[PDB]
Amino acid sequence: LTLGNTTSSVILTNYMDTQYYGEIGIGTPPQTFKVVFDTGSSNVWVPSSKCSRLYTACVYHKLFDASDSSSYKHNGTELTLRYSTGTVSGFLSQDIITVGGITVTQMFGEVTEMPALPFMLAEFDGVVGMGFIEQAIGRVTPIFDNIISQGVLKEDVFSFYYNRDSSQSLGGQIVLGGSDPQHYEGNFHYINLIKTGVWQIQMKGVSVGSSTLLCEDGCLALVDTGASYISGSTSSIEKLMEALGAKKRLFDYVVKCNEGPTLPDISFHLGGKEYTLTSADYVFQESYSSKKLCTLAIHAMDIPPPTGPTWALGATFIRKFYTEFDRRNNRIGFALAR
Ligand SMILES: COCCCOc1cc(C[C@@H](C[C@H](N)[C@@H](O)C[C@H](C(=O)NCC(C)(C)C(N)=O)C(C)C)C(C)C)ccc1OC
Ligand SMILES: *[C@H]1O[C@H](CO)[C@@H](O)[C@H](O)[C@H]1NC(C)=O
């Protein structure tokens, strides 16, 4: 590990508080793509110009065309990426990628099969996995490992800032090689990784209102920058939602809008601190009418072993807590976002 003097930032766009993505350039000349920097996975991929137009998601997104890049290097190994809410398939390719001023030769997947659900609902084109090589499909070296190999980043860490963006403001920000003191206050508090190669930590309990109603025996929390909400197993969530008086729909839970401001606080016991969210933090309070339903930013999601079962702390959590991902010391640090 050779540290340097550099830190780079990528400005992110906030789409309706559910999708946070930035931009990257691939090839020569650069072909730009909107990508989610996802700590939940470790591969980089973008739709390919070889994706059948019968996949409507390929008709609606930017496609990488190897035939227009002079820095492209062929590989072709098949690759299938299975995420908890969708799958993409294609083959491996290599080219130079620019991420916030840093230029790195990276192997990424050219996706040729991209399902309408959920990709037709994606504002982003692709993904830049921020996880460890242990979780990389095909054992492909993750982009951050490749940047760290260059010995330019001041620190072997990267940080996330997600705004409550609502027209002339910064949707979010990723800092490669450190954090931005301008977006958090107080001190960072850390929790060591409960495992090797996954941004997952031990969670001591989850409380709703008065007491620790859930995760009483301890549980796992995966800090997922590529997730819109805080999710837990169906069991946990049914019990949580029971406590909230929320009603279960097909893909989410709602509450009569007038009841929203009434909902209790929900805390997550991580390491030495309690991380508390008020209803305002987890309710999409779009109305105060008892005649309208307001969705909650907390969902049920069952991740299978060996990673799951596990809670996933997504944008709902990150919006309140600036997050630093420390590879050097295998821990995650949270600070109050500002
Ligand atoms: C915060 O805004 C980011 C985008 C949110 O919106 C979407 C997120 C996804 C899923 C994420 C990916 C997940 N965050 C994923 O990383 C979750 C993890 C996962 O499935 N990882 C994949 C691997 C292969 C590592 C695995 N199965 O373990 C789980 C283990 C938590 C995208 C980056 C593809 C799909 C569609 C979306 O909007 C239309
Ligand atoms: C492409 O990539 C892998 C490394 O992930 C390499 O070792 C493999 O042999 C390459 N194959 C081809 C056909 O280029």
Swiss-Prot record:
The keyword Membrane applies. Disulfide bonds join C51-C58, C215-C219, C257-C294. The active site is at D38, D224. The keyword Secreted applies. It is found in: Secreted; Membrane. Residues 20-335 form the Peptidase A1 domain. Its EC number is 3.4.23.15. Interaction with ATP6AP2 results in a 5-fold increased efficiency in angiotensinogen processing. It comes from the Eukaryota. GO terms for cellular component: apical part of cell; extracellular region; extracellular space; plasma membrane. One of its GO terms (molecular function) is insulin-like growth factor receptor binding. Its main location: secreted. One of its GO terms (biological process) is cell maturation. Glycans are attached at N5, N75. Belongs to the peptidase A1 family. Renin is a highly specific endopeptidase, whose only known function is to generate angiotensin I from angiotensinogen in the plasma, initiating a cascade of reactions that produce an elevation of blood pressure and increased sodium retention by the kidney. This is Renin. The lineage of its organism: Eukaryota, Metazoa, Chordata, Craniata, Vertebrata. The chain holds residues 67 to 406 of 406 of the full protein.
